Amino acid sequence: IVGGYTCGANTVPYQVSLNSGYHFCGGSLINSQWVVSAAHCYKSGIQVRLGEDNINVVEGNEQFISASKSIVHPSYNSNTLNNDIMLIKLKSAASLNSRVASISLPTSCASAGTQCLISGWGNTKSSGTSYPDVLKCLKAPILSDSSCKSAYPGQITSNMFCAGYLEGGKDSCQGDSGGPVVCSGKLQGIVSWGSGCAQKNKPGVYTKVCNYVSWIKQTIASN
Numbered sequence: 001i002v003g004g005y006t007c008g009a010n011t012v013p014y015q016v017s018l019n020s021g022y023h024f025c026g027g028s029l030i031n032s033q034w035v036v037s038a039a040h041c042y043k044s045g046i047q048v049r050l051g052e053d054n055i056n057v058v059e060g061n062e063q064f065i066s067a068s069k070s071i072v073h074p075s076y077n078s079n080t081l082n083n084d085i086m087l088i089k090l091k092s093a094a095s096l097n098s099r100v101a102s103i104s105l106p107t108s109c110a111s112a113g114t115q116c117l118i119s120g121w122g123n124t125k126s127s128g129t130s131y132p133d134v135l136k137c138l139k140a141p142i143l144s145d146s147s148c149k150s151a152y153p154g155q156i157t158s159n160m161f162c163a164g165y166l167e168g169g170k171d172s173c174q175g176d177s178g179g180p181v182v183c184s185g186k187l188q189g190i191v192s193w194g195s196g197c198a199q200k201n202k203p204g205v206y207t208k209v210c211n212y213v214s215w216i217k218q219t220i221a222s223n
């Protein structure tokens, strides 16, 4: 996250860290046994870490659970990153508590102008590399699709939306992928891609979760 602030320990209780010997992507807990993340974060041998704040120090509120199965969306295109979403089933159910809670799926899609909260353990520099150890947060609005499509011609589909600051300065970055975008108490996006981080006229691009609630609900009930 570039231009964000330190969230505070366990203030984003639905945020998860996917680890394969190191933190490589974020995710969101949707219920005791399922996590949603981006499909481009797919890897075999994932350990989901919940109740995390400093990912390098065990502070006591963490739960490390291995994934029993991963489902990448049937229409995921790794070239355009259209349908960038995947579900992960935990080997055991997580114990939900004050520090570990799930996020609710949306009943409708959000409007341009709505403010959201984006969080993650990714790079914090637009031009440089600085990876933090504690969770960072950033508040950003959803941008009109017109401004999104004008920043990226021919690349935006109906399953994506942009959020951020066209002036640059604030944005999600790599290491934040798969993580949540929550607006009004519902999970509306997943960190997917963008052009660099916090560059002018290059806002972040997110997976539009309101278009996948039926596939999500149907898939977790059958697995």
Ligand SMILES: [Ca+2]
Pocket: 052, 053, 054, 055, 056, 057, 058, 059, 060, 062
């Ligand atoms: Ca920790």
Ligand code: NA
Pocket: 025, 026, 027, 119, 120, 121, 175, 176, 177, 178, 179, 180, 191
């Ligand atoms: Na993240």
